[PDB]
Amino acid sequence: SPWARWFPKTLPCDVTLDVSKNHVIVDCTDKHLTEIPGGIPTNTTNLTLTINHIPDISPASFHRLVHLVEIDFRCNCVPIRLGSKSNMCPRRLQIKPRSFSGLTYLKSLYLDGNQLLEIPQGLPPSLQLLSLEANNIFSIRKEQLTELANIEILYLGQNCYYRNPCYVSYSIEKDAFLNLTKLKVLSLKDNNVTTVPTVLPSTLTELYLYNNMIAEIQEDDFNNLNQLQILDLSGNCPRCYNAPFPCTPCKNNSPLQIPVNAFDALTELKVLRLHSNSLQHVPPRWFKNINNLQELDLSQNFLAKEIGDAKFLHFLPNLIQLDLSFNFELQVYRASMNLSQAFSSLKSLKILRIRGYVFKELKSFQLSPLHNLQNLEVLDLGTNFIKIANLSMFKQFKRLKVIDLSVNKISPVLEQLYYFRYDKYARSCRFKSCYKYGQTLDLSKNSIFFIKSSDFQHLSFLKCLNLSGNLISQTLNGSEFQPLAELRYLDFSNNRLDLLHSTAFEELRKLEVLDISSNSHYFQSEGITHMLNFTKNLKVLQKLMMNDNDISSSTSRTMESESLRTLEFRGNHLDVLWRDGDNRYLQLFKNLLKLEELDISKNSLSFLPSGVFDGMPPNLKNLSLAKNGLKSFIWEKLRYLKNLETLDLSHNQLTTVPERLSNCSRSLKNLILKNNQIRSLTKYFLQDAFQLRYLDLSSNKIQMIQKTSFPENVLNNLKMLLLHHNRFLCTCDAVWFVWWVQHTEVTIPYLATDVTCVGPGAHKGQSVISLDLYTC
Amino acid sequence: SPWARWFPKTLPCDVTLDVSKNHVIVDCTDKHLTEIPGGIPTNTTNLTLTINHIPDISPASFHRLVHLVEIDFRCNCVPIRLGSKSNMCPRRLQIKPRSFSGLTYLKSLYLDGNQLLEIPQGLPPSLQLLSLEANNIFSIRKEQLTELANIEILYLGQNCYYRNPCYVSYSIEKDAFLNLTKLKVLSLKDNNVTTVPTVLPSTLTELYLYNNMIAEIQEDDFNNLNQLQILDLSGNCPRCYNAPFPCTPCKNNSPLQIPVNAFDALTELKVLRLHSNSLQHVPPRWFKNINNLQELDLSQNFLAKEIGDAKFLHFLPNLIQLDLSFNFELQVYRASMNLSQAFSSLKSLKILRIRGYVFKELKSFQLSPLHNLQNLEVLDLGTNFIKIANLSMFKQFKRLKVIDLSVNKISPVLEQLYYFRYDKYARSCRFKSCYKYGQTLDLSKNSIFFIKSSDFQHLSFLKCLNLSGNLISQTLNGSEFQPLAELRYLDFSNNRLDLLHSTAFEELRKLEVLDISSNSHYFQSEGITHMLNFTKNLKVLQKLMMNDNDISSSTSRTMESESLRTLEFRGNHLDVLWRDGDNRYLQLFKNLLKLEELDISKNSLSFLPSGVFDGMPPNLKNLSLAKNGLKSFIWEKLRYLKNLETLDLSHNQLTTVPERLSNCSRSLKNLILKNNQIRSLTKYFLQDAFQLRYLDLSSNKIQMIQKTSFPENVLNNLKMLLLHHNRFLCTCDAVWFVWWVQHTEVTIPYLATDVTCVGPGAHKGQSVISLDLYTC
RNA sequence: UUU
RNA sequence: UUU
Numbered sequence A, B: 001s002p003w004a005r006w007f008p009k010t011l012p013c014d015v016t017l018d019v020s021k022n023h024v025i026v027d028c029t030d031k032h033l034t035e036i037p038g039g040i041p042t043n044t045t046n047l048t049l050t051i052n053h054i055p056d057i058s059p060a061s062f063h064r065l066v067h068l069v070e071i072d073f074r075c076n077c078v079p080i081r082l083g084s085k086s087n088m089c090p091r092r093l094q095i096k097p098r099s100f101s102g103l104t105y106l107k108s109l110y111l112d113g114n115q116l117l118e119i120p121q122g123l124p125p126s127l128q129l130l131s132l133e134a135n136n137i138f139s140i141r142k143e144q145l146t147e148l149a150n151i152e153i154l155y156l157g158q159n160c161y162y163r164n165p166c167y168v169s170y171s172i173e174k175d176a177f178l179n180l181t182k183l184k185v186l187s188l189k190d191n192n193v194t195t196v197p198t199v200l201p202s203t204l205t206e207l208y209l210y211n212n213m214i215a216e217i218q219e220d221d222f223n224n225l226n227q228l229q230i231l232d233l234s235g236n237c238p239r240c241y242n243a244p245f246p247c248t249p250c251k252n253n254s255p256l257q258i259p260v261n262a263f264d265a266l267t268e269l270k271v272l273r274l275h276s277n278s279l280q281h282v283p284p285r286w287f288k289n290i291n292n293l294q295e296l297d298l299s300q301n302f303l304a305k306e307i308g309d310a311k312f313l314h315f316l317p318n319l320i321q322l323d324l325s326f327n328f329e330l331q332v333y334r335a336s337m338n339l340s341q342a343f344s345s346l347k348s349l350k351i352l353r354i355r356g357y358v359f360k361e362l363k364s365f366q367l368s369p370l371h372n373l374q375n376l377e378v379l380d381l382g383t384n385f386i387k388i389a390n391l392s393m394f395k396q397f398k399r400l401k402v403i404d405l406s407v408n409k410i411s412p413v414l415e416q417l418y419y420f421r422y423d424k425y426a427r428s429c430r431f432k433s434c435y436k437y438g439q440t441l442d443l444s445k446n447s448i449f450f451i452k453s454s455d456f457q458h459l460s461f462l463k464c465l466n467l468s469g470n471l472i473s474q475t476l477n478g479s480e481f482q483p484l485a486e487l488r489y490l491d492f493s494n495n496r497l498d499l500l501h502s503t504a505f506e507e508l509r510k511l512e513v514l515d516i517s518s519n520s521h522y523f524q525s526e527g528i529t530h531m532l533n534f535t536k537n538l539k540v541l542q543k544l545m546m547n548d549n550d551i552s553s554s555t556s557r558t559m560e561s562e563s564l565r566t567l568e569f570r571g572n573h574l575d576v577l578w579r580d581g582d583n584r585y586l587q588l589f590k591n592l593l594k595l596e597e598l599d600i601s602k603n604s605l606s607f608l609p610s611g612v613f614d615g616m617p618p619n620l621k622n623l624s625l626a627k628n629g630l631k632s633f634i635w636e637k638l639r640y641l642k643n644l645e646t647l648d649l650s651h652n653q654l655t656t657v658p659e660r661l662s663n664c665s666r667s668l669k670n671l672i673l674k675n676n677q678i679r680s681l682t683k684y685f686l687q688d689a690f691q692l693r694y695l696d697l698s699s700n701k702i703q704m705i706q707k708t709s710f711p712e713n714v715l716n717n718l719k720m721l722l723l724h725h726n727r728f729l730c731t732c733d734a735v736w737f738v739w740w741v742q743h744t745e746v747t748i749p750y751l752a753t754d755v756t757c758v759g760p761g762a763h764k765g766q767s768v769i770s771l772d773l774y775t776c
Numbered sequence C, D: 001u002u003u
């Protein structure tokens, strides 16, 4: 950070630099500002003020800031229902005239979420991007668009919908956008639009008309858009069954009415989204002149019958992605899957998703139309309530990256809300997985209670198997997964593993990662034999996760591995296994010879009995003891951890630091003490601690730091030093620290905002960075 | 509390009165004391000082306190391993001489957990009870027992064991206790005792010799104890398999050796505990002269074979309780249960526990020896890894109160640690269920994935069924429980209920309480139809618990009941169902016409949209909105809840109270605002709020309270007012409050200890009750 | 802070 | 705090 020494440390904003674009970026996101801060550098190019309470903008706002290419002034007055009900914006944002017209270089302007009533005027002709989402602008008129000749990108959505209502239909003047001769992207989503606006500039590449009241498309509506690549008409005549938002369908179960010739102009179309349009038929004719369609979304329609027919697919040999999820006929539970022969035409297909078709049995041959699709990578059949499926059918799908049968009822990545989101592409005010192991079979959240070898016959190619969230209550003995000779990752979390036998999992001879987290069930009942020593047999295991198992007893006293590097053991009861006076489990982790990372956070350890560190394995580097309620800690015992580099002690009740950190651990690089009860440092704390790089003392109760505790020869090595949310006393005794804080180049986050005096007197609440201690 | 106005409010101890015994009880438990407090009333009879740091006792300690009948001075210096590792006691408690000899009326003295080295001398002859547990007294000599002639009760345990070791065998002089001619109870547990001390006073009623190194009983050892009622020899030659403490068995798997005539003197014996004695045989001869034995514990032995034989039981026709739990042969999994014919002799038997026998199949006829035990109430067969059991066999057990099959592997109240506790009867430093509905079948924590009517065929008598913690993933439709016509309580928690059908549970026509908590599984996946309106059909349902289900969607918009009085709905996502601008679920609870208690805590409600309170059902009395992260609350809306009496708003972020509580809710009796961010009250807050009785403002950030906020005509009605852990400013502006706090008789808990100034100056940390504001 |  |  030598380039940053020119800028003031008092600025409550994060400053960064894109060298080679000569951009100075300044980020004042969510800093509780009522004024643009004075201090913003003259050379600032990208300025972000989103999530603040600046009530107006004037020519004074940006007078000095002549180099601005981008202003992000979003969410300073968000509509009532979109916003905080504690911090309700009293009055819309006021933009006085001539506020932007002076910015010759302004390429991007964001004014979303400010309750604006009309399109801001006075905008410079250099402007390429204008964003006005989540305002109250519901009438577009040619008169208002006169200064936007150079505009390429226009975002006008979310100005009239259930969360920001305008109480009328959206109005666009005939030809409103036609004279914007460089317009590439236009978004009119979530707006109560009733007809496609015409005529649109032929230069458009992307048009978003989704979530509106458009009941019909005219054959003329997209006539001239011969450069269009993305069209989204989704959510016009929506499918409302289980919608998690208020939802009015078109009268009489009617689909969005699209004439057969309506897409004929669209020769460049790559992407077509017709999600939630209540479609019953997909006429093949639609696609006659679209030869390069790559992505097609037909989810949330009523296309169950069509999936069995689907003549349209013969016209899509370059399609990469096809989504037909959630097309089930209400109240019907089909016996089986009827996939059309036509799916065999989809020669370029990489991703097929057919969630929510809703059927009882998947027979091997019902996916045969896909067997010869050479490029198919993902087949998603989740959320189908499938009860029966012979998994061996996926031998015909070795070439796939992912076979997803998540959320079904089988017995012997996309975001969680996705197909049922109102607008999954919506912008927040804040901003603008084992697949890498190879072939993956995802059986998570099914009803598998018992597994046996024969279940995985013909699946020896699998690299990752996800059995998370089944019902498996079995004493695994090393015979259940015998065919999975190539398996590298197994997720067995959220089952009810019964570790009676130490031969469990031994047959997975290439296993690298095993997750048996959240199998607490048998660990919670007394008198049950549990063998934690099963690790010995897994000869290439690197990572073992056994979190949230409530482990408080083990019949074996040692875990052993020649290979394991990482062990997550959080949310167990090491406090019970290491009860004071009981030596038996002090060497629990000692024979994990290659162990470098150990997480024993959330284990309810008020104290560590002696023996614990001596019993750690010799290569331990990363140790977490976070969130244990620790109240004391013999720092001297760190001498036993000769390779320790990171010690996470956050979120405990430690009241002291070691007298001499260098006499405790020569190797220690990162020490994390945040959220403890430390009231003072020790006199020579960091002395001679040359190896230290990172030190978090944030969220403690520290009053004073003196120079002897914090020698410069150490501090100037620190990559980072965190000191915020402490109880700093700002008397003349604190003068070294106050001065040092003001002048050091050591990185201290939240320095301007949250390193604050608690006293005395009128110093309360005042940043230490701004403090003038002229009498000391 | 008029009797209590005589005692000082500054006393950091709870004072109470047993009228009619003329006892004044004073409790200073855990108040961080280094001195006995001055202020303890002269008439104090029972004084408790446990869990403090008083380093010595002298004649000054109790000079004034001449009426003391009981001193509880435990745990002022607990042994290192038993105690806090943060607050380690530096030095044993010092008892200077003549400290007790002046107390003519002292009947009970507790000095446990003070690292004492010898038995305290100078004790008054009125003493009936002396307790010295958890000290370092490991040699008993007749010389030391000279002042104890009147002693009835002596507790000497926990002076030499794995958590407080003495490093030698315990020593008792021959005849040590013989001359204590009134000794009734003697406890030598947890002491490294190697032989039964002889000869013991014949007046003994209870003798606790458990958890020791006693390998043999001599035929003479209990010769003269013809009044003995309780004998505990447990844990001498322990069974160590899966012991959760360090455990050395007697050499060569050897049992505790008890001669066949060893109990012949014990004609009064009611209770015999032989838990964890590695017994292989129970010779019938032991019980020849014990005709009134009521309770017998033979758990944690090696009696699996003996349970199939068991001739000793013919000699126990008055036995009420028999425990044979955890007798399995290591490494053996029996095909079935072999119960001896002899169990049919147990004519008085009420409770039989046979956990941990460990067998695969329970056939109907294998319990036939119990069929004609007329008084049998509890049959406990938990933790047996039973895989098969025809539940209809319990038609032969209609008369039982509880049939417990908890923790087995069946596919189509004791504390948690109990049989594996080191000492389940141990004293803490601090102190010294659906069964009521009728017949209960507990199938919790089994492997039941599917249920059907025929499973419950001859079980129509059941009143309570616990299916908690099975694997049930089924769409219940009202046919699965048809035979359970008399069922009143069903616990279906920790399954995976799939509420597709609104007919679920309708067949349980007499159902009063239904628990479907922790069935979150299908609620977490989008697009799944869920019918919360199933409540309509259950015509006598009183209480419905549906906690921690993560509910964020429902196909139905209303829950309906003519009968339901309590609904627990905590740990769901009402925030999503009541998203601002979505009206559809604002009447979710409206048609629960008789609903009086609603818990919607932990539902992630930053705010309540309007409509919520209007949509509450008309008889709502008890509402919890705790732990929601609420940041604002329109108090005026409480007008809609015309019968509200309790409002729990604890653990939120509210920053204000209503301007006028009486203009918000005339009916409100208990208002709970603890753990919020309230900084000041409103000027007339409680004015005219005559109906208020309970008000918790603890753990806020309150600086000042003025008289206008807190009128006396309201306050003097308050049963309780909580004000602790606030941020009180102690200036002259606070004078009304400081004075009022000092003189009111309103109950304010923690007044002496935790109502404290934060400022200004040297007032910091000082109790407001002690504050002298003489200049105001 | 005798479990 | 546009989900």
Ligand SMILES: *[C@@H]1O[C@H](CO)[C@@H](O[C@@H]2O[C@H](CO)[C@@H](O)[C@H](O)[C@H]2NC(C)=O)[C@H](O)[C@H]1NC(C)=O
Pocket (backbone or CB within 6 Å): A018, A023, A025, A045, A046, A069, A070, A107, A108, A128, A129
């Ligand atoms: C600073 O603002 C400029 C102008 O809005 C951003 O420029 C974009 O940069 C990306 C890649 O970095 C290009 O693909 C876009 O074409 C540019 N947009 C325009 C309108 O010119 C720049 O990225 C911003 N930088 C930061 C770090 O926020």
Ligand SMILES: *[C@@H]1O[C@H](CO)[C@@H](O[C@@H]2O[C@H](CO)[C@@H](O)[C@H](O)[C@H]2NC(C)=O)[C@H](O)[C@H]1NC(C)=O
Pocket (backbone or CB within 6 Å): A160, A161, A162, A164, A165, A166, A167, A168, A169, A170, A192
């Ligand atoms: C979308 O526009 C419609 C009409 O095109 C709005 O509906 C009108 O709203 C007012 C106030 O609720 C009613 O008095 C009228 O009856 C409605 N008219 C019709 C024809 O429905 C609607 O509010 C707009 N939607 C949003 C979300 O703003």
Ligand SMILES: *[C@@H]1O[C@H](CO)[C@@H](O[C@@H]2O[C@H](CO)[C@@H](O)[C@H](O)[C@H]2NC(C)=O)[C@H](O)[C@H]1NC(C)=O
Pocket (backbone or CB within 6 Å): B160, B161, B162, B164, B165, B166, B167, B168, B169, B170, B192
């Ligand atoms: C109970 O007494 C035994 C012996 O009676 C103690 O064992 C001795 O302990 C010390 C230190 O562990 C050894 O050096 C001795 O050699 C042991 N002697 C024998 C005879 O075993 C034991 O420590 C005592 N137990 C407790 C818990 O205090």
Ligand SMILES: Nc1nc2c(ncn2[C@@H]2O[C@H](CO)[C@@H](O)[C@H]2O)c(=O)[nH]1
Pocket (backbone or CB within 6 Å): A475, A498, A499, A500, A527, A528, A529, A530, B330, B331, B332, B333, B358, B385, B409
């Ligand atoms: N944990 C477990 N133990 C079993 C089972 N079946 C028999 N056992 C035996 O039960 C005892 C306690 O777990 C041990 O002796 C086991 O060998 C089972 O399914 N799970």
Ligand SMILES: Nc1nc2c(ncn2[C@@H]2O[C@H](CO)[C@@H](O)[C@H]2O)c(=O)[nH]1
Pocket (backbone or CB within 6 Å): A330, A331, A332, A333, A358, A385, A409, B475, B498, B499, B500, B527, B528, B529, B530
């Ligand atoms: N919740 C649930 N829905 C099912 C099941 N089988 C079919 N469905 C159908 O799937 C859709 C979503 O639940 C509804 O139309 C249901 O009728 C099942 O086992 N559970």
Ligand SMILES: *[C@@H]1O[C@H](CO)[C@@H](O)[C@H](O)[C@H]1NC(C)=O
Pocket (backbone or CB within 6 Å): A308, A334, A337, A338
């Ligand atoms: C599925 O297709 C088969 C023939 O391949 C046919 O018998 C059946 O009617 C189809 N099912 C439905 C529900 O349309």
Ligand SMILES: *[C@@H]1O[C@H](CO)[C@@H](O)[C@H](O)[C@H]1NC(C)=O
Pocket (backbone or CB within 6 Å): A390, A392, A393, A457, A458
């Ligand atoms: C499942 O299919 C495979 C052929 O891929 C066959 O080996 C196996 O026997 C089938 N099992 C069942 C239960 O249908």
Ligand SMILES: *[C@@H]1O[C@H](CO)[C@@H](O)[C@H](O)[C@H]1NC(C)=O
Pocket (backbone or CB within 6 Å): A406, A433, A434, A435, A444, A445, A466, A467, A468, A469, A491
């Ligand atoms: C297994 O499935 C669950 C989704 O049901 C998911 O949370 C988990 O991440 C998956 N595992 C892996 C390794 O991706």
Ligand SMILES: *[C@@H]1O[C@H](CO)[C@@H](O)[C@H](O)[C@H]1NC(C)=O
Pocket (backbone or CB within 6 Å): B022, B042, B043, B066
């Ligand atoms: C209270 O103590 C006094 C002084 O020792 C005694 O005279 C008086 O009788 C006691 N009161 C009662 C009710 O015992």
Ligand SMILES: *[C@@H]1O[C@H](CO)[C@@H](O)[C@H](O)[C@H]1NC(C)=O
Pocket (backbone or CB within 6 Å): B308, B334, B337, B338
């Ligand atoms: C259980 O008793 C039967 C006879 O009723 C006997 O044949 C069987 O072997 C017994 N089992 C064992 C393990 O002793």
Ligand SMILES: *[C@@H]1O[C@H](CO)[C@@H](O)[C@H](O)[C@H]1NC(C)=O
Pocket (backbone or CB within 6 Å): B390, B392, B393, B457, B458
């Ligand atoms: C269980 O026993 C009952 C007799 O009480 C009988 O009705 C039934 O056939 C048995 N059920 C099974 C599944 O064996």
Ligand SMILES: *[C@@H]1O[C@H](CO)[C@@H](O)[C@H](O)[C@H]1NC(C)=O
Pocket (backbone or CB within 6 Å): B406, B433, B434, B435, B444, B445, B466, B467, B468, B469, B491
């Ligand atoms: C059901 O059993 C579990 C023990 O697994 C217990 O938590 C629960 O309290 C029992 N339910 C009732 C109503 O007693």
Ligand SMILES: *[C@@H]1O[C@H](CO)[C@@H](O)[C@H](O)[C@H]1NC(C)=O
Pocket (backbone or CB within 6 Å): B477, B478, B479, B503
């Ligand atoms: C469940 O469905 C209906 C109840 O409405 C019933 O007639 C049917 O027989 C039931 N079937 C099963 C298999 O539970």
Ligand SMILES: *[C@@H]1O[C@H](CO)[C@@H](O)[C@H](O)[C@H]1NC(C)=O
Pocket (backbone or CB within 6 Å): B502, B503, B531, B533, B534, B536, B537, B555, B556, B557
């Ligand atoms: C539950 O709601 C659904 C539709 O929302 C309706 O079909 C059904 O009749 C309702 N059932 C009851 C018992 O109220």
Ligand SMILES: [Ca+2]
Pocket (backbone or CB within 6 Å): A770, A771, A772
């Ligand atoms: Ca200055």
